[PDB]
Amino acid sequence: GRVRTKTVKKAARVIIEKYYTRLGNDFHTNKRVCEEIAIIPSKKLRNKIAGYVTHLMKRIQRGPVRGISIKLQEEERERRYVPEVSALDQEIIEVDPDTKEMLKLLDFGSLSNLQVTQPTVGMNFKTP
Amino acid sequence: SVQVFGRKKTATAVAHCKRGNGLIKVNGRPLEMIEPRTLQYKLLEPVLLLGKERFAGVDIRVRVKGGGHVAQIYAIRQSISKALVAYYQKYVDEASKKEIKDILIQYDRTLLVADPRRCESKKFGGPGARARYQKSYR
Amino acid sequence: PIKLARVTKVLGRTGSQGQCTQVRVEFMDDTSRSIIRNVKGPVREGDVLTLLESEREARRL
Amino acid sequence: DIKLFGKWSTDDVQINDISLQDYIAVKEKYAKYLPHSAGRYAAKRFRKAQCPIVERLTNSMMMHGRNNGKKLMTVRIVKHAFEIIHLLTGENPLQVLVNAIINSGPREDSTRIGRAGTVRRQAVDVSPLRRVNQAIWLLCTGAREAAFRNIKTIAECLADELINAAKGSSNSYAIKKKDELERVAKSNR
Amino acid sequence: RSEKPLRSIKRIFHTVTTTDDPVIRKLAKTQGNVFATDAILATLMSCTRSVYSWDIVVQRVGSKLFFDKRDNSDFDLLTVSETANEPPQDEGNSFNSPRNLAMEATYINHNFSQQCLRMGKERYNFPNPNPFVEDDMDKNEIASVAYRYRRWKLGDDIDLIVRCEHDGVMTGANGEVSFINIKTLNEWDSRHCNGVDWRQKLDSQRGAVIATELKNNSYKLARWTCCALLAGSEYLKLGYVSRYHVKDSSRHVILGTQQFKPNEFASQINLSVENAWGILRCVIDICMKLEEGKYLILKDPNKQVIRVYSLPDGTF
Amino acid sequence: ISEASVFDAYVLPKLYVKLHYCVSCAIHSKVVRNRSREARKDRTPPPRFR
RNA sequence: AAAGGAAUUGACGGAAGGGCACCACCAGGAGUGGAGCCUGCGGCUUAAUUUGACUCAACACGGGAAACCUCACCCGGCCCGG
RNA sequence: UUUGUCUGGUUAAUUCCGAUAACGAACGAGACUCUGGCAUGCUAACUAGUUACGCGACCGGUCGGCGUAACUUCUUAGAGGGACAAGUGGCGUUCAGCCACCCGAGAUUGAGCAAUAACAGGUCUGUGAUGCCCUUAGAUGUCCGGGGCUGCACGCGCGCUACACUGACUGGCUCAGCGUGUGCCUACCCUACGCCGGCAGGCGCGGGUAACCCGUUGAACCCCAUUCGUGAUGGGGAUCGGGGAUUGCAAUUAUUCCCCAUGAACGAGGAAUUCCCAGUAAGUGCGGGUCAUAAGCUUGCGUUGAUUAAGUCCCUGCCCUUUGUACA
Lengths: 128, 138, 61, 189, 316, 50
Ligand SMILES: [Zn+2]
Hints:
This is part of a larger assembly, with chains A, B, C, D, E and F. By secondary structure, chain D is mainly alpha-helical. Chain D is built from 6 helices and 2 strands. Chain D has one domain (about 1-190). Chain D is globular, with a radius of gyration of 17 Å. By secondary structure, chain E is an alpha+beta fold. In chain E, the strands form 3 sheets. In chain E, strands 2, 3, 4, 5, 6, 7, 13 and 14 form an 8-stranded mixed beta sheet that branches. Classes of the chains: A mainly alpha, B alpha+beta, C mainly beta, D mainly alpha, E alpha+beta, F little secondary structure. Chains in contact: B-D, C-D, C-E, D-E. The complex binds zinc ion. Chain B binds 2 RNA strands through strand 1, strand 2, strand 5 and helix 3. Chain F: Component of the small ribosomal subunit. The ribosome is a large ribonucleoprotein complex responsible for the synthesis of proteins in the cell.
């Protein structure tokens, strides 16, 4: 089993929160990055840290990760909608007539952009 | 001129390969004079595979030590193949090295690539690495 | 007679002692159907089975 | 032109089954000069199938404890047994080994169920790699047990065993036990 | 995983009818009562596996009976993925219609029949000429093809002459020359019909692949080993090609090749030699009792039933 | 059975057994098994569907 | 001088359900158990057959394969190093 | 007192992902040390070698055969480098990861280390570690001498040797590797080579406190020819007689060895059961221990080297969750 333990995937994430301007997608660059940016004892931890920051940079640039901070949103405020006509600009709004009685008794409904539709017959809304 | 080894085990063979009119000698005896003859084709496998024209410029002298007999045979054939490929990369052009390496690797990878397996140690409580003693209950 | 079958998918190991896999077997010889049979031994997809009795489907053991 | 033992062509022999076409490794890539490869083949699931069939054949003759570990003894035995095939029958012996292994793997078998010691068995069928290696085990039994106590030596007995599974005579312990352990799967149904 | 690109090779490809052979017309005078081509007499043997439709003419002139082929037909075109649990159904403007994929198939067959040879060698030549081409053209652009006109004796005064072929030769294992029939299996998109990626899947499992295309391509593959034993071939070779990216057929790539024997290839594809000649003769045991006129043998597009049809006046 | 029926397309009948069980022989017969102190308030019957 | 009520943690079951392990089985191999022999232990005899250990967690274990020393053990005697 | 430490997925692992009144952590696991696998790239060297020479010996080749100038491939061993599930395809609540395949020496090398806390587990026979009780001069201190632990109507266990033709016996041939080597106390050592015997050995000159001498550690199995021919036989070598040598103050209750003789069950073992997943099981020898003499045991080293599985909770134990108590 090759599951990464707590230190090689917490330490890799605290390495990724700062120092994002140095990291990349290739493993052999980040492996050489990791000794200027940290004090790690011997290399098998450092190769495992480099493997997880390469896997995390493989993950992270196509969407949000839960564990990573809004330094991601600093990338999405650094790198990144409405329609032309709004979806609330429709020209006929169907209104079933209890709403029309409400609008008439709120001193509206003299103005007509709406169209009242026919009331339902049958009251079978419950489940058996 | 190259000398380049091949090993399988604590058996170690290195061939001394320099320029000539054709030769193969394993510790002063030629390749048709080695003792196991149910394994005669293993040492002859570059001679049958590459042909005697591919050896046509070299004098190969093989010196072996260590190991058993069969591990010594498997180091002889690997050292011979690495001898010809090291001569071919230094003195012949590299497409000939490419042709000789795909004709040698695709047949058998122990002709060019070593064996990383060594004998694992005995530990206590049993007569081998894994086996354990008979452990009566009553 | 004797109908040959081809494996498309493996459906997990089964049995009391865990010895028998069961697979989806599609027939080749004169017939076309896709059924479950259970095997003894290691299978991969693309294995060819040889069924003496040719009809029986096998749920569980 | 890779020839087995210096003398055997691998170019011409006929695997007449589809199910063992990738599971008897004798054809052109697996043409080797010798039945020794010193391989790393049983280190993964399904790398032991594309070990050559001759290499599996000489390793399965190493079986009992007087003859454990000794490979070149069985290389010598399989060499003289293949020459016994070429002298007694005179056909290509690689068709005799292919015909023995294709013909003698039992196509149906039985499993034990019944919660560990009340005997009610159930019939299922056999995977093809299990058929190939079951066939080599039923071919290496027979011949050693039929040259255990005899004046006959082993090489004639083993080559005759591969002959006797290549043609299907029912003196063959591979064929005899094939029919028996498929007919009890016929019986527990 | 070390593969080589498949180039497109332009040669002139001959589909010659029995009537369009003048040597079959030259051999019409002095021998025989039954004459056809080994494309056609395989299809009477391998009529048990066709799903898609064709026709075969029966031509009786006197006591000399001829099986000739249609002129506006896609009869050489291979069927594709035919016998699966789900066939290709798709439409013409998509790439994977059986219209273009059959047209992809015999383009790919005629490509690899010359691809796996050297042009540079001297050919193994026969002392006879091929008669439907004049030898004075210096373009030399034919494929390597042989034609062998051989003679069988069948009882009840029926003489079966099959116009057969051989398509290649290689140097043998002992110093012999050894005769090759070349045909080509093809892998168009291996996801849909339980399909296996041969770059991945035939590295141990060559035998999964034959079981796949016995299940997919049975009418195509059974026809080849039908004509093979009539050739009496010393070797059988089958070719494996695939397209480069899985949707766009403009490029295809050769992965590798396999070598067989025809009885090794008959029982592995469930061809029994006794059944195929019997359905060969049953049409002939009918059609030697028929009178002169025009005839037709088809396989139906929908149903598993064939007919011998009297063709009325002057179609073919 | 279906190859022996003289009637074409005879759907075979079902067996309607109404079983009462005591409280001792359900936990012997595993029909009903002992549950937690806080999931005893679940009186929805157990699912038979996937 | 407690008997009892309700509730928590733990141990236990001749309860229900999961999980792991070749000190588990399954696929299987070399074996062991039957045979002569070295060796330990139970008994039996001895003046003594010293001794600890008895299911893994005793029985080629005390690094214990002791001819004297080892040496505890027996038969007889010197010895203060009271 | 509980949640944190869990319905689930995943892991060799409370390893992680995910769910979430929990958020962040510590010990154990993992990390770490030692070993194994790679380097024509560095450092390199008469107690290590290669090779171009110079000469000798033998019919261009052979020479571990005798001595020189360059190099570090082979030997030794440091300093760093290197493999990370990193690259690709698929599966996957698109998250842990899992599977497949190239490039690669290498895509689970093996051992040490080992938490909370407990058992009436073993050891007062390792102790000038010991508390008390005991004996303490016709001693249970302490020495010298014969005897003992070795005895056998009989069990149980660890092991060795075999039940043969893949063998046995006789000749030939050719290859290892961990390491040991002259001692405060104290006599106790590794052995070359020459002479004499058929052996254990006798006798003398030498070398060695060690990469120097034993030692190229000329190991066994395996390999190649001879004979034997299914017989309790030429397998089995148990038991049993006379003789020679070595050790030692002393070999009887034969310590060990060799010569000759003798030829017992045993022909592949029944219910139960032991051990094991790649240089693994097993076959086969060689060192260390104990030792004035020394291994059927143990601890290592190598050599020849596979079948079979790539999973399950049926069995056997064990942990966990829910549940019942009048048990603490
Ligand atoms: Zn009841």
